[PDB]
Design a protein around this ligand. Structure first.
Ligand SMILES: [Ca+2]
Lengths: 223, 58
């Protein structure tokens, strides 16, 4: 996360780390046995790290659970990045409460201006490279489809929303993918893509989670 | 070596932190980098062995 701050330990109970040997993506626990992430973060074997804070030190509060099933959206487009969503089923239910908690699905889509929280262990530098051991947080508002589409002419589908600041300086970055964008206690976005990081007029584009509640419920309730 | 061994490295526009190897045409050796998971180029191999085979001479 670029231009953000270190979150208080275990302040984001729903944030999970995706591991295949090292941290490659993020995610959010929607229910004790399912995790939501991005489709481009797909891998055949993935371990979900719950209750994490400092991904480099065994602190004692973490839960290491392996994925039992991995489901990417049927219509994921590797080129346009449309439908960048993926569901991972844990092989064992996560032991919930306090440091490990689920995030609520959207009851309504978020409107432009709504303030959200974006968290992750991604790059903190918009220019150079720097990866935090500690979880970073960022408060950013949902932009309007207008600004988003002007920022990326011909590249914004109805399944994407720009969250960020057109003046740059703050944004998500490499390592944050699959991560959570939570506004008013509901999960509204998944860190997807963007031209660079924290660049001016190039906000971050996220998978619009409200366009998939029905699909998510059905998939979970049938797997 | 195929033409793609001379393409510069490209992480892409996605924000994933995926370890992959590319042939550094400057240092003339395969190296490690981080692919975002989408829209890169052919100078992107899943293992260092593969890379050394195609671009170095294995
Ligand atoms: Ca730790």
């Amino acid at each position: 996360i670029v231009g953000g701050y270190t979150c208080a330990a275990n302040s984001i109970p729903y944030q999970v780390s995706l591991n295949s040997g090292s941290h490659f993506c993020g995610g959010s626990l929607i229910n004790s046995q399912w995790v939501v992430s991005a489709a481009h973060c797909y891998k055949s074997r993935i371990q979900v790290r719950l209750g994490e804070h400092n991904i480099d030190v065994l602190e004692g509060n973490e839960q290491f659970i392996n994925a039992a099933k991995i489901i990417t959206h049927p219509n994921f487009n590797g080129n346009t990045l449309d439908n960048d969503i993926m569901l991972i089923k844990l092989s064992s239910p996560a032991t919930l409460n306090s440091r490990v908690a689920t995030v609520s699905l959207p009851r309504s889509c978020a409107a432009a201006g709504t303030e959200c929280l974006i968290s992750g262990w991604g790059n903190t530098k918009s220019s150079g490279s720097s990866y935090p051991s500690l979880l970073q947080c960022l408060k950013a508002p949902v932009l309007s489809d207008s600004s988003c589409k002007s920022s990326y002419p011909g590249q914004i589908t109805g399944n994407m929303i720009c969250v960020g600041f057109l003046e740059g300086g703050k944004d998500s970055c490499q390592g944050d993918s699959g991560g959570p964008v939570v506004c008013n206690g509901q999960l509204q976005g998944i860190v997807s893509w963007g031209y660079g990081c924290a660049q001016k007029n190039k906000p971050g584009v996220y998978t619009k989670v409200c366009n998939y509640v029905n699909w998510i419920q059905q998939t979970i309730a049938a797997n | 070596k195929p033409d793609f061994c001379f393409l510069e490295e490209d992480p892409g526009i996605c924000r994933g932190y995926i370890t992959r190897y590319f042939y550094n045409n400057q240092t003339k050796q395969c190296e490690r980098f981080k692919y975002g998971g989408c829209l890169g180029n052919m100078n992107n191999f899943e293992t260092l062995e593969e890379c050394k085979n195609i671009c170095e001479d294995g």
